[PDB]
GROMACS .gro file of C-alpha atoms in nm:
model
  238
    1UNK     CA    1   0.000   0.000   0.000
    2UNK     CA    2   0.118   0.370  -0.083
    3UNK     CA    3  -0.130   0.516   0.179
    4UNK     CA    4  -0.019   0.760   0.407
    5UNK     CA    5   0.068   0.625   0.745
    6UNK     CA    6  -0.020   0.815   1.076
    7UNK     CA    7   0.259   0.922   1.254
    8UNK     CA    8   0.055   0.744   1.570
    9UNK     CA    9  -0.027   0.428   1.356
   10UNK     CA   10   0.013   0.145   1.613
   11UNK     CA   11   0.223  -0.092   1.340
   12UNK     CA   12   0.506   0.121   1.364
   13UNK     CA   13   0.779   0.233   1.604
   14UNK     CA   14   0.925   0.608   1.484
   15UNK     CA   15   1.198   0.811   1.647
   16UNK     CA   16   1.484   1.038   1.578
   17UNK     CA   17   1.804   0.922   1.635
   18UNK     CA   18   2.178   1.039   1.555
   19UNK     CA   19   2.434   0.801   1.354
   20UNK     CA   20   2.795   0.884   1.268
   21UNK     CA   21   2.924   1.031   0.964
   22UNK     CA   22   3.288   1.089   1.022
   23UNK     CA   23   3.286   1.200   0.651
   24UNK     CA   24   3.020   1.406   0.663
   25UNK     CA   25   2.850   1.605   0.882
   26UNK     CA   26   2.966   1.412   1.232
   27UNK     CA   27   2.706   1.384   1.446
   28UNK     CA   28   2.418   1.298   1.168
   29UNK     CA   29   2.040   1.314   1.300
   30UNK     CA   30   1.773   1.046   1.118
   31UNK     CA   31   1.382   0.943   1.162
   32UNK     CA   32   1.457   0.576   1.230
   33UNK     CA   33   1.106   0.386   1.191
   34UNK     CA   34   1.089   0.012   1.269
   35UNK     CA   35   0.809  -0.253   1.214
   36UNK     CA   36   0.598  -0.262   1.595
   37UNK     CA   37   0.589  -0.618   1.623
   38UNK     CA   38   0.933  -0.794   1.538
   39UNK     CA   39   1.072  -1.099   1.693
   40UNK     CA   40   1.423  -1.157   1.477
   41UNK     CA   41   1.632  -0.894   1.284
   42UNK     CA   42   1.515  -0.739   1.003
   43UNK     CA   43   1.638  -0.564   0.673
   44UNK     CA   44   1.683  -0.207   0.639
   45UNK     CA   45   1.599   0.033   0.387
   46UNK     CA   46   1.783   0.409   0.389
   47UNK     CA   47   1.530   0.652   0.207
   48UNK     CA   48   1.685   0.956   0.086
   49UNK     CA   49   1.485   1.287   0.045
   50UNK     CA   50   1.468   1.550  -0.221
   51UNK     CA   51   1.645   1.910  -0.233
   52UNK     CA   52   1.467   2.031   0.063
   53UNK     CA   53   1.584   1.820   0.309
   54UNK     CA   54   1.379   1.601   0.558
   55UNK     CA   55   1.008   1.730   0.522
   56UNK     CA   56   0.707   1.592   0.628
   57UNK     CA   57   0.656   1.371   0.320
   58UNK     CA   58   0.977   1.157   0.302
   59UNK     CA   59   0.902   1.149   0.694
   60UNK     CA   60   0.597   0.974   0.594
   61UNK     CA   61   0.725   0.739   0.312
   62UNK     CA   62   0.969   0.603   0.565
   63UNK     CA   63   0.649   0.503   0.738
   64UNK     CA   64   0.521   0.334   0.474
   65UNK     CA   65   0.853   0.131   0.406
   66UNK     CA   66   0.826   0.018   0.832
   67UNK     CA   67   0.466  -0.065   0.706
   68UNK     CA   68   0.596  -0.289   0.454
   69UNK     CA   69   0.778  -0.477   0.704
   70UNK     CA   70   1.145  -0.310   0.686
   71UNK     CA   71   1.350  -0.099   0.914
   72UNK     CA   72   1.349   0.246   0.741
   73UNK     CA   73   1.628   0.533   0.819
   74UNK     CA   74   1.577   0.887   0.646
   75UNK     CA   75   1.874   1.115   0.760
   76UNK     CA   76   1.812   1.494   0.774
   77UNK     CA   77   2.057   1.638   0.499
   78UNK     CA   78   1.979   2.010   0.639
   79UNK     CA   79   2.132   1.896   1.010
   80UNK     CA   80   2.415   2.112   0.981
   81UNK     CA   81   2.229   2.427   0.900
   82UNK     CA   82   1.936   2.394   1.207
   83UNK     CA   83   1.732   2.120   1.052
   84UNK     CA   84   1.448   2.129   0.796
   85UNK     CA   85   1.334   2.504   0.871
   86UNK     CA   86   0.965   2.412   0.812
   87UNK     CA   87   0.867   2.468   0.459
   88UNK     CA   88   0.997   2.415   0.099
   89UNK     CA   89   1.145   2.713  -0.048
   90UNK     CA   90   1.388   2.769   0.259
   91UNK     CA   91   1.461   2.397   0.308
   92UNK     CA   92   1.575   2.409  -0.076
   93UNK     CA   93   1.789   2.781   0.013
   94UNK     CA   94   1.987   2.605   0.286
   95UNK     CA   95   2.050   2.241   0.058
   96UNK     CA   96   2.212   2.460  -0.174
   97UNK     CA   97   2.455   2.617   0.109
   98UNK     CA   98   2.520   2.269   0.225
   99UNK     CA   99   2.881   2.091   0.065
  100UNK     CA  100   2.744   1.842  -0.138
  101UNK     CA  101   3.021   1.561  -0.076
  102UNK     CA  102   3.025   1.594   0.319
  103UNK     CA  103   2.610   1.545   0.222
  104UNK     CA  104   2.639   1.259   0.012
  105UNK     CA  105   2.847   1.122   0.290
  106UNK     CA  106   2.587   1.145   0.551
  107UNK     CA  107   2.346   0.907   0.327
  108UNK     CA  108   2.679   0.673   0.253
  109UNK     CA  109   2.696   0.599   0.627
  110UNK     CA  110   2.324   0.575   0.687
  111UNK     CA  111   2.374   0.309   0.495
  112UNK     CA  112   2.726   0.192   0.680
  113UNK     CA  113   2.528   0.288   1.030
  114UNK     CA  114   2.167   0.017   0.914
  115UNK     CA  115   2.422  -0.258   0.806
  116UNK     CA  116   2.546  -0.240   1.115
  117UNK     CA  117   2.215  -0.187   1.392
  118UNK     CA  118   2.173  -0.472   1.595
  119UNK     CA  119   1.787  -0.487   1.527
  120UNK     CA  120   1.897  -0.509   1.135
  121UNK     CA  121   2.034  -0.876   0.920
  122UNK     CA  122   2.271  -0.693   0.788
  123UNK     CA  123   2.106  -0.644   0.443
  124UNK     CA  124   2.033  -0.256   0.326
  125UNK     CA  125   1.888  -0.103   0.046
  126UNK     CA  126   1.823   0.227  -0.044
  127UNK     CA  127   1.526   0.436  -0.218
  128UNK     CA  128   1.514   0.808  -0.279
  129UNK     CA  129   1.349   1.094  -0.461
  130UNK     CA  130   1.444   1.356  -0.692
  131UNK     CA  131   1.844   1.474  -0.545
  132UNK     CA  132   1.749   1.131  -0.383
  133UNK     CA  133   1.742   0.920  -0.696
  134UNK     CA  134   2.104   1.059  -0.794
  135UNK     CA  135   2.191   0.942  -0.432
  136UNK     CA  136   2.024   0.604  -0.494
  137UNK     CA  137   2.247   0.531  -0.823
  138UNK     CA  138   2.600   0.684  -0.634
  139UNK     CA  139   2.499   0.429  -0.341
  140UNK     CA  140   2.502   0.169  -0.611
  141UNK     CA  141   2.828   0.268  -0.758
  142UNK     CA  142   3.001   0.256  -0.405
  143UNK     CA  143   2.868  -0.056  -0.219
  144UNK     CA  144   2.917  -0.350  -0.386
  145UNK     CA  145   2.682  -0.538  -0.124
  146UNK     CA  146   2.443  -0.328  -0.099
  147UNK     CA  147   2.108  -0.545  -0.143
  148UNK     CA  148   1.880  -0.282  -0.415
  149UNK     CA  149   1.882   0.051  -0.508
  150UNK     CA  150   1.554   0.207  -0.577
  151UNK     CA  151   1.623   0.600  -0.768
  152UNK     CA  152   1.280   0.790  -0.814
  153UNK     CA  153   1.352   1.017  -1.073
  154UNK     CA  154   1.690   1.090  -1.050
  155UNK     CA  155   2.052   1.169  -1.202
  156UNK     CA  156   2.188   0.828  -1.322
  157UNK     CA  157   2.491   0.677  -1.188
  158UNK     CA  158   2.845   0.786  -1.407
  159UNK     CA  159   2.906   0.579  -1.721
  160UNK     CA  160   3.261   0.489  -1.638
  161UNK     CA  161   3.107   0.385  -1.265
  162UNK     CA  162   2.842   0.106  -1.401
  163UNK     CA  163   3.069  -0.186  -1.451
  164UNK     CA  164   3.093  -0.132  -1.025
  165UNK     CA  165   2.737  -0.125  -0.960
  166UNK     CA  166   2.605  -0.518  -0.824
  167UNK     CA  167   2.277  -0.370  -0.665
  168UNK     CA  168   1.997  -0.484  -0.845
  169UNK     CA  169   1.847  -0.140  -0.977
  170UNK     CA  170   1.474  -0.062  -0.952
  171UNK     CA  171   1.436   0.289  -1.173
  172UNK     CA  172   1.147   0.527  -1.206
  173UNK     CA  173   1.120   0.748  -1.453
  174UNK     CA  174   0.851   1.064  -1.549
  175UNK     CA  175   0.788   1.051  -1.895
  176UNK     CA  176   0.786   1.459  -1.911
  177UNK     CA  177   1.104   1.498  -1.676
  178UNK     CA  178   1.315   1.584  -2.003
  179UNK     CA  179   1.613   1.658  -1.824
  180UNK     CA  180   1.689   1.298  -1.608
  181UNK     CA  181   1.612   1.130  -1.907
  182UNK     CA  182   1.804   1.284  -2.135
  183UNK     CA  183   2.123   1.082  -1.980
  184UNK     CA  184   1.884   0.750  -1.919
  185UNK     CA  185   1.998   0.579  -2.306
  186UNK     CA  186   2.372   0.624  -2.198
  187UNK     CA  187   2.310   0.471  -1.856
  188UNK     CA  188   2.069   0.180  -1.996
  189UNK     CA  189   2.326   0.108  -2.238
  190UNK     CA  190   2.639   0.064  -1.983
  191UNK     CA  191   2.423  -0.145  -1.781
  192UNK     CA  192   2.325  -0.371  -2.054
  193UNK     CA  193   2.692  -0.368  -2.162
  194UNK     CA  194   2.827  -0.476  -1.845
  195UNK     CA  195   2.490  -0.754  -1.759
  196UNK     CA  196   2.359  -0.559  -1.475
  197UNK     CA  197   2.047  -0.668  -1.332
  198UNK     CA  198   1.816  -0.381  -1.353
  199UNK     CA  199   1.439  -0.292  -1.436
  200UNK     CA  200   1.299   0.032  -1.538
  201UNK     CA  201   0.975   0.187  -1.666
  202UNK     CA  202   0.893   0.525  -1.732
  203UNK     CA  203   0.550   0.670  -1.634
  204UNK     CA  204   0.353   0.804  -1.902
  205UNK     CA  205   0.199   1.160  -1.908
  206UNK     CA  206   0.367   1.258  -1.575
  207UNK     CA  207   0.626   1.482  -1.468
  208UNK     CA  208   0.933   1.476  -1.197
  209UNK     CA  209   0.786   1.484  -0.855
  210UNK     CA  210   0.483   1.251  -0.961
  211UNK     CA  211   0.514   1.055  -0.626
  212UNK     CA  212   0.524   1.343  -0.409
  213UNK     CA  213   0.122   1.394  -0.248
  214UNK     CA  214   0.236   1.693  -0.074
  215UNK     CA  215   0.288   1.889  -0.443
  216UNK     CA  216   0.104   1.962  -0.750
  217UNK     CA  217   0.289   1.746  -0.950
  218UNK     CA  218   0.149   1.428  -0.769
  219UNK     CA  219  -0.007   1.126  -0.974
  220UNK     CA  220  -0.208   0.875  -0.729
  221UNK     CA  221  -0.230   0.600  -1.014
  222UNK     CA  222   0.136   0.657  -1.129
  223UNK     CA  223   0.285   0.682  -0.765
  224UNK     CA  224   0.110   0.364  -0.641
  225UNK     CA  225   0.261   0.182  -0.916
  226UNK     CA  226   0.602   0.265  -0.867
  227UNK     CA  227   0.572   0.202  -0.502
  228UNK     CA  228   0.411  -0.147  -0.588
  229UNK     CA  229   0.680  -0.230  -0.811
  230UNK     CA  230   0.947  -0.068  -0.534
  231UNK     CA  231   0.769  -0.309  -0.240
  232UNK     CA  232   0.827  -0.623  -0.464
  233UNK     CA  233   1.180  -0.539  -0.566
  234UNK     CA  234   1.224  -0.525  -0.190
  235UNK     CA  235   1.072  -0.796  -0.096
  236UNK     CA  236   1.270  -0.996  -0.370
  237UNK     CA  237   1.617  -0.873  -0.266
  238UNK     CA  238   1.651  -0.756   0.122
   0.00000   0.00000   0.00000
């Protein structure tokens, strides 16, 4: 299901927590969500947000992932500059300001920090949206075990990087979002080159954005789709 989940909803188990980035930002804070009711260890997911750091919608979709039955981190990208400040346009002001390697980082050891959590198998993956995507496909790049990669929308991974990538790759793509897919043949063609295992479909008569219910750019019948497809991939590989 791609339903909002209450923040209260008695399934889940939400709180902030801090993890380390010692190439990043230090001291990183993230919305950890778990599954209520869990007897063993369980896989983790690390969703990564758009260009406006954490905001109430990837807060939710990290409760949807814990619905799904996975352990779901979403690290605030805007820690270092006083969180997100509460709406949009400034959240996207201060991403800017932000260095984008020591921010990259932070999301790198999210995923370090979930492979690691004692609650966790050991198994992550990683989904993300818009900036998130791009992170999604660098996250592939870099971590050779790394169980899936799920980019919404995002900048593809470098061409000389794809022979690295061994995450199975789940893409999404908005048939109107001219400028990701503009570099989508190059990347489709080094993965096919190099045998990657990878699915993608692009969403007809939609733009960038198209899962995001908070905006006007929102599609119900294209969103649940994707995050069908994304639950399945999941289930398949964590």
């Amino acid at each position: 299901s791609n339903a909002q989940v209450e923040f209260t909803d008695p399934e889940i188990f939400a709180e902030y927590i801090t993890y380390p980035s010692p190439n990043g930002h230090g001291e990183v804070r993230g919305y950890l969500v778990k599954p209520a009711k869990m007897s063993g260890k369980t896989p983790a997911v690390v969703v990564v947000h758009e260009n406006r750091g954490l905001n109430p919608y990837i807060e939710d979709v990290a409760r949807r992932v814990a619905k799904a039955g996975y352990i779901a981190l979403a690290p605030d990208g805007l820690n270092s500059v006083g969180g997100y400040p509460g709406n949009d346009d400034k959240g996207r002001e201060l991403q800017q300001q932000v260095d984008p390697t020591k921010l990259m980082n932070d999301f790198f050891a999210a995923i370090e920090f979930m492979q690691r959590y004692p609650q966790a198998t050991g198994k992550v993956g990683i989904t993300g949206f818009c900036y998130g995507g791009g992170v999604s496909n660098a996250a592939a790049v870099a971590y050779p075990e790394l169980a899936c990669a799920v980019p919404f929308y995002g900048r593809q991974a470098p061409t000389a990087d794809v022979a690295k990538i061994e995450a199975p790759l789940l893409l999404h793509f908005a048939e109107l979002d001219t400028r990701i897919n503009e570099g989508w043949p190059a990347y489709e063609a080094a993965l096919k080159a190099n045998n990657k295992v990878y699915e993608a479909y692009i969403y007809p008569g939609v733009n960038h954005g198209f899962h995001n219910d908070s905006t006007p750019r929102y599609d119900k019948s294209a969103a649940d789709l994707a995050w069908q497809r994304t639950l399945k991939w999941f289930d398949k590989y964590l």
